[PDB]
Amino acid sequence: GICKSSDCIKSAARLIQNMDATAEPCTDFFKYACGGWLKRNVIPETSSRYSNFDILRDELEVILKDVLQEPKTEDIVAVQKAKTLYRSCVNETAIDSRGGQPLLKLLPDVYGWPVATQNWEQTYGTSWSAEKSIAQLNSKYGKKVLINFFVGTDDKNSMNHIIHIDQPRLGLPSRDYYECTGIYKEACTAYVDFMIAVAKLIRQEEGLPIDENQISVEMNKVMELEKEIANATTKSEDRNDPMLLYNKMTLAQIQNNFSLEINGKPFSWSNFTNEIMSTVNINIPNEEDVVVYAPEYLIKLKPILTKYSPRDLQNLMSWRFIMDLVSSLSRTYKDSRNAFRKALYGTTSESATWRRCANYVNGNMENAVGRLYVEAAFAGESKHVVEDLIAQIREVFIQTLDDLTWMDAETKKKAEEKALAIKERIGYPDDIVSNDNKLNNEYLELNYKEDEYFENIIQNLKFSQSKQLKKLREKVDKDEWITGAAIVNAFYSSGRNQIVFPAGILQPPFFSAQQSNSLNYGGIGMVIGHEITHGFDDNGRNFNKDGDLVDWWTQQSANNFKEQSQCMVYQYGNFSWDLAGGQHLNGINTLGENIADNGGIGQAYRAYQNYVKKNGEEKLLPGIDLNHKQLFFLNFAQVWCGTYRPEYAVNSIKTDVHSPGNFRIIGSLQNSVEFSEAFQCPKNSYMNPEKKCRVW
Amino acid sequence: GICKSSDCIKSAARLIQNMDATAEPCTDFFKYACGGWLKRNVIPETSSRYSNFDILRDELEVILKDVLQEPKTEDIVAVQKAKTLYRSCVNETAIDSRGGQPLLKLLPDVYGWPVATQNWEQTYGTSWSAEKSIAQLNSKYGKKVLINFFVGTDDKNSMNHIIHIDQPRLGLPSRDYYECTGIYKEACTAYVDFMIAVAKLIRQEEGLPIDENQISVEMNKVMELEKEIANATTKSEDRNDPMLLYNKMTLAQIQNNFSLEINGKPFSWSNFTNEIMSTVNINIPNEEDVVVYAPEYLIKLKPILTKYSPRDLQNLMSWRFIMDLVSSLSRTYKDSRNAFRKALYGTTSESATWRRCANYVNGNMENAVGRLYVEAAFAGESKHVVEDLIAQIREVFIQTLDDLTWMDAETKKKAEEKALAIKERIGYPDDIVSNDNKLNNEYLELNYKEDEYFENIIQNLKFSQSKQLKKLREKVDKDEWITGAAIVNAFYSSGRNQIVFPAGILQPPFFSAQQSNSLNYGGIGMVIGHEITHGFDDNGRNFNKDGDLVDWWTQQSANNFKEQSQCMVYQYGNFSWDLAGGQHLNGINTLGENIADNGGIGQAYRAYQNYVKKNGEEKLLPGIDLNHKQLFFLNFAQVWCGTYRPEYAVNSIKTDVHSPGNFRIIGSLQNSVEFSEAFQCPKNSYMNPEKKCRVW
Ligand SMILES: CC(C)C[C@H](NP(=O)(O)O[C@@H]1O[C@@H](C)[C@H](O)[C@@H](O)[C@H]1O)C(=O)N[C@@H](Cc1c[nH]c2ccccc12)C(=O)O
Ligand SMILES: CC(C)C[C@H](NP(=O)(O)O[C@@H]1O[C@@H](C)[C@H](O)[C@@H](O)[C@H]1O)C(=O)N[C@@H](Cc1c[nH]c2ccccc12)C(=O)O
Ligand SMILES: *[C@@H]1O[C@H](CO)[C@@H](O[C@@H]2O[C@H](CO)[C@@H](O)[C@H](O)[C@H]2NC(C)=O)[C@H](O)[C@H]1NC(C)=O
Ligand SMILES: *[C@@H]1O[C@H](CO)[C@@H](O[C@@H]2O[C@H](CO)[C@@H](O)[C@H](O)[C@H]2NC(C)=O)[C@H](O)[C@H]1NC(C)=O
Ligand SMILES: *[C@@H]1O[C@H](CO)[C@@H](O[C@@H]2O[C@H](CO)[C@@H](O)[C@H](O)[C@H]2NC(C)=O)[C@H](O)[C@H]1NC(C)=O
Ligand SMILES: *[C@@H]1O[C@H](CO)[C@@H](O[C@@H]2O[C@H](CO)[C@@H](O)[C@H](O)[C@H]2NC(C)=O)[C@H](O)[C@H]1NC(C)=O
Ligand SMILES: *[C@@H]1O[C@H](CO)[C@@H](O)[C@H](O)[C@H]1NC(C)=O
Numbered sequence A, B: 001g002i003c004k005s006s007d008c009i010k011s012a013a014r015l016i017q018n019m020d021a022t023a024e025p026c027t028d029f030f031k032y033a034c035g036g037w038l039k040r041n042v043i044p045e046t047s048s049r050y051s052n053f054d055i056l057r058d059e060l061e062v063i064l065k066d067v068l069q070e071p072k073t074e075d076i077v078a079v080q081k082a083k084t085l086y087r088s089c090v091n092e093t094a095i096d097s098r099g100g101q102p103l104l105k106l107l108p109d110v111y112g113w114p115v116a117t118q119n120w121e122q123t124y125g126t127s128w129s130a131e132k133s134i135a136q137l138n139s140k141y142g143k144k145v146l147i148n149f150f151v152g153t154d155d156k157n158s159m160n161h162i163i164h165i166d167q168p169r170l171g172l173p174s175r176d177y178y179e180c181t182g183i184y185k186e187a188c189t190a191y192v193d194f195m196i197a198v199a200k201l202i203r204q205e206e207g208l209p210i211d212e213n214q215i216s217v218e219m220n221k222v223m224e225l226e227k228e229i230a231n232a233t234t235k236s237e238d239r240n241d242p243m244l245l246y247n248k249m250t251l252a253q254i255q256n257n258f259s260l261e262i263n264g265k266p267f268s269w270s271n272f273t274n275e276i277m278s279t280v281n282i283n284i285p286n287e288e289d290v291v292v293y294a295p296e297y298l299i300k301l302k303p304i305l306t307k308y309s310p311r312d313l314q315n316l317m318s319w320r321f322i323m324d325l326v327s328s329l330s331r332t333y334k335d336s337r338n339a340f341r342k343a344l345y346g347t348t349s350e351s352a353t354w355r356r357c358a359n360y361v362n363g364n365m366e367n368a369v370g371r372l373y374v375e376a377a378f379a380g381e382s383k384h385v386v387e388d389l390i391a392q393i394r395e396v397f398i399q400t401l402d403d404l405t406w407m408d409a410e411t412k413k414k415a416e417e418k419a420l421a422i423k424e425r426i427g428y429p430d431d432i433v434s435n436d437n438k439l440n441n442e443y444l445e446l447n448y449k450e451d452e453y454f455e456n457i458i459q460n461l462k463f464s465q466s467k468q469l470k471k472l473r474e475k476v477d478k479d480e481w482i483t484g485a486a487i488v489n490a491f492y493s494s495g496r497n498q499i500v501f502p503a504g505i506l507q508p509p510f511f512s513a514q515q516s517n518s519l520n521y522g523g524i525g526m527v528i529g530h531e532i533t534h535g536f537d538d539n540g541r542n543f544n545k546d547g548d549l550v551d552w553w554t555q556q557s558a559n560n561f562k563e564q565s566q567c568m569v570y571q572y573g574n575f576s577w578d579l580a581g582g583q584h585l586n587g588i589n590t591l592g593e594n595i596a597d598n599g600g601i602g603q604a605y606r607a608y609q610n611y612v613k614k615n616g617e618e619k620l621l622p623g624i625d626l627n628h629k630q631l632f633f634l635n636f637a638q639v640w641c642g643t644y645r646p647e648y649a650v651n652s653i654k655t656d657v658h659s660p661g662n663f664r665i666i667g668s669l670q671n672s673v674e675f676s677e678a679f680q681c682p683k684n685s686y687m688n689p690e691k692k693c694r695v696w
């Protein structure tokens, strides 16, 4: 009754190596399952986080490097353009020789950076307006400042596109950082120093005098301004309810209630919106319907902006533009971000150039790179098998509904209806391999050159926005993939009600038709359950089978959902993270992911149980004395083996909607009776609390 | 009859994961044994070379990190200093904030760097001399330029120390690079650009004007000068006969034979040698016996040094000094080496700081670190077993002499006599664990600062040189170990006639109590044979049982040795390496290592056969359809699994005395009748040529 395949041996050794059998399973199963892993793996200097996931992603990047660096030869134009772009990216010699000249060239096109202009007020200050300035940064360079304007899906009509207005993101990772005290104080000092440093560098390249106190004054003025804007933004905790975020109104109505005063003149929303949309030849009338996500912010925005001069506003806007471009210039400009970056991620060095370039090319040509990846590392025989894993888990979810006691019959039936309506995406879209002509034409208007890297990335910003802005009047192109194939991740789309599993994640330890079923359900199986459950988490449940923000819940069932999930808010909220200095996790912002973890793990387990009942039990793995019930949970946990840098630990608590792998394991298994039955944990042992949370 | 232990499981899996069972063993055993290894273990972005050996040192560095990173209250002074040194090394924030100041402050000590000095002739020209300049770099920093001077063992009198004179190494890996054409072209450009880049950095920090053209003129002269010096050096092929290299003469005779004119003045050897030896208060009279290794080089030096100014000479000498320190300064100085590092190693970044620091501390406090390593990771239970393996292989060597028909009777008796006299070193010197007082005394004169890494490394350079120079009138201490314990390697000393196996190499795949005997003999068994055979290769055979360079060979047997060994020169010289662009191995420079490889595996296999004969067969490994004769050779080969970046393949093929692992596997097994019997290789298959080489 012992497995003797080549595969089972490699598999077993892997389980054995990562675990620490000297640890007690019921005190800390993370340490039990990943103790060996942690003792073996050190976080790379360039990584803010290291884990199984990060390793699989690092291995994928290598594959990308291999295909991108390859001599052209019998390549379609789409692939050639990808390789050219990559070549331009890795050539630091050409980039270093250009200094900061590529940035200094286009600064007038964004109405300049006052601190880096000897006299900004007469060069730009006469033809200047916040409307044209914000619009230019938005529509040409994808930089969203002061007001986030983007064309997106109508929440309540998933077949249409519509203008969205929201609060913008900030220079720092979150609004909390702008307290600038304690664990943020380090971020703020490096941040302001980052400003001053780049200001001096640019002025030195233009051949201008350096008043370092004055540069420091203006940048502290910028920081003063951004602190207010950050303070005016709504907390993420008050933005987890999609129904509350949706405010549809006309442009004229926006003009009426969210007026702004810049330089003693009224801000014109019509002028602003049309400055953006004229780039794609679309007129925006006063009767245009618009969705406003952050009405409270725009209100608070009025007293702030009216206190500042055009110079102060432009100083901030151009800075937000430049800070994301300095790392695309010479080595001297790259180094200006080191202290800032080190404060936020704990990384003493930026990632290897070829890594960033592979990701950059993949992020901007996801179909072209996806094509190369699946031909190099993805087997086609994987589809119908993942198909087989998904059908089981989908069915488990529907069956589980009858067991769940916090829903009434009508809500269960509607939940079932949505579950049956979930559409799936696996591996890659076929036509990126079988249809050369379509793929070529996707990137047809891009025309890259190796000696102009900066021109290439500026071109991409313009291409990305232009492509997106044009969608306003188009109906949504569903089946459009929402991710490249060369991605180590999985996704749920509430708007499309679909689950997506790209080729990058369909590999060990998540998945292999050549590894055991016990291992598969605990890996990709849990992941499939995770993505499905997202359709029914605190966010997804608000969308119907068609992807529309519509309430299909009874008041009683909805309140029960909130009651059931509140258990998880406290549980994960009570977790103290030593890597983040004892600071607690956001039980509210991670709720959806925790619901997804807890539901997914149970679904994968139920489905595995159904499999065993259908074909019988599997032969044991050699060299490790655990049954397959135990092995399921062991593989689940080893999927989430990992560790964090302290700087990034603090960051991710406020910016990552996921819990760290450590607590995804502890939290989920604590609520699992089946786990405690498998490892015979005593009652009220740390892994077996008497109080257990349960949603799906 | 199949092993089922957890130890056997990960042992088998390792073998399985590394091999490629689809490859034909008799066509290419490297591909067969290491094919899977190649796919699984992609070269890390910070590695120029990657291999099993390299993997083991990295895992060892992790252990060193754990035992160095945390202060403990009971830490003896020696350990505190090692930890203080490590802490100073890894504090990059403190290092970055000091820029190049530690170097700039230090540069006067070596008579400065003319190109980066305001007025070099004024400041240093008055007191400058070549004797003192070379001597200072030598006696304080161990940096050997123009003429190599060192205190070492007398080749012909192994109890004494004596002064040696030899040709120095170069800034580039070998004399071949200075052709600067073809495969050496990029290296030369980056090398000179490196000079220019550092000159600019230092001058900028000193607040001096930057004249690009003037700097370029001076630095190309440095290259021009070093080209001539490189061309004057004697080829490595002509330096493998220890008898021909040994030229004993008095200092007076050296002045007579090897006069030199520099800046119009005659070079004084008495002054030069006494400028060095006065640092440890030893006077060197004219009657002092000296060993001169490169008389031809010193003669060729005569017309070269006369053509150059003190500025030219010092620009080169101080550059040789600066290039090895720049990576120990702030990031900007680190990055100046980037293009140069890539040219020689292909690496895109410097290896992890903590890895470098762990290695650095290990290199400078090998006993203190060796102590921490063996207490944390080395099973002392291993020693007696290794003792027994050594005895077996020693006895096999002696017995094998009867089979060798190319030696007459009395040379065989002499060979046996030396074999019997070989002394062994296993694990670590006992004193480093059992004697705190002795360990503390070793580092008594050392005193490190937490925040001055550069100051600490300068102290170490001076201390290291001083300690060695002081030995000139002392007898050689034989019990003194020639390696630290925390080392993944093994050694043979011609001068001591001893074989050394530090704890670091006493681990899988070489050796483990939880490892099959076939693997142990194929691993550490072959390694033991390798080191023993080194005592009888083209170099070792020239030294007697007490380590003295004396001829104990009959003329015929010596001639026959040259004939037998000549086969291997041709064999390995005919090997072309695709990673090195088709360059051929150097059959002459690798002869010694190739002789040891071929001898050792034969000795190890015979010893293994004897062991199985007396103790019986072992249980087979799961998932591997091979018998133990085959597992012997599989494990032997996987010891040498690895791959090279093209730039370093070119590098190593011109500098490494070893063959690449690729050809150590192919070469040794081509000559192994026993290998071909085990895998039933047809005559004249690639792995089984009908013409085979045989020495030992
Ligand atoms: C396997 C499955 C659980 C994947 C799962 N993705 P999911 O949470 O559905 O999706 C997440 O939120 C969406 C809003 C974003 O669009 C996605 O990019 C992702 O961040 C996840 O936990 N992703 C985490 C963990 C992770 C995935 N790939 C990784 C690679 C390296 C390190 C961590 C990861 C993340 O994206 O962070
Ligand atoms: C038989 C083998 C187990 C040990 C064997 N050391 P050995 O050749 O006796 O000795 C080596 O070369 C001599 C010329 C030098 O004098 C020694 O200092 C030592 O560097 C060797 O092949 N060393 C190689 C392989 C190697 C040892 N440690 C490594 C670490 C990383 C990569 C490769 C290696 C090398 O030094 O390269
Ligand atoms: C990377 O960029 C460098 C700098 O632009 C390129 O080097 C130049 O190459 C052109 C091509 O003929 C020459 O005309 C120039 O003289 C080169 N200048 C320098 C300073 O080297 C280099 O070719 C680029 N790499 C690749 C692979 O195209
Ligand atoms: C937004 O407002 C600006 C002015 O604030 C408009 O720019 C003017 O355009 C007209 C006609 O194109 C010119 O005659 C003026 O000289 C421009 N004035 C300035 C100050 O630039 C711009 O056209 C408006 N955009 C939209 C879409 O209405
Ligand atoms: C390397 O050094 C040798 C001598 O050590 C140089 O050989 C001399 O070359 C000149 C010019 O052709 C001849 O006139 C001499 O007769 C040669 N001398 C000997 C002893 O051969 C050789 O040119 C040098 N090569 C380089 C590249 O510098
Ligand atoms: C050092 O120089 C002396 C003198 O030239 C060399 O000794 C001579 O060697 C040649 C041939 O080797 C003989 O013909 C002479 O009779 C020797 N003269 C004396 C006085 O011994 C000696 O070989 C040189 N040594 C080195 C290492 O170059
Ligand atoms: C944030 O804004 C509110 C008003 O919207 C104000 O009362 C409060 O003082 C502000 N806080 C900071 C830190 O500026």
Ligand SMILES: *[C@@H]1O[C@H](CO)[C@@H](O)[C@H](O)[C@H]1NC(C)=O
Residues within 6 Å of the ligand: B087, B091, B093, B094, B451
């Ligand atoms: C590193 O050095 C800096 C400055 O000398 C000091 O502030 C810091 O505490 C040091 N960090 C460590 C870990 O020693």
Ligand SMILES: [Zn+2]
Residues within 6 Å of the ligand: A530, A534, A593, A596
């Ligand atoms: Zn998720």
Ligand SMILES: [Zn+2]
Residues within 6 Å of the ligand: B530, B534, B593, B596
């Ligand atoms: Zn050797």
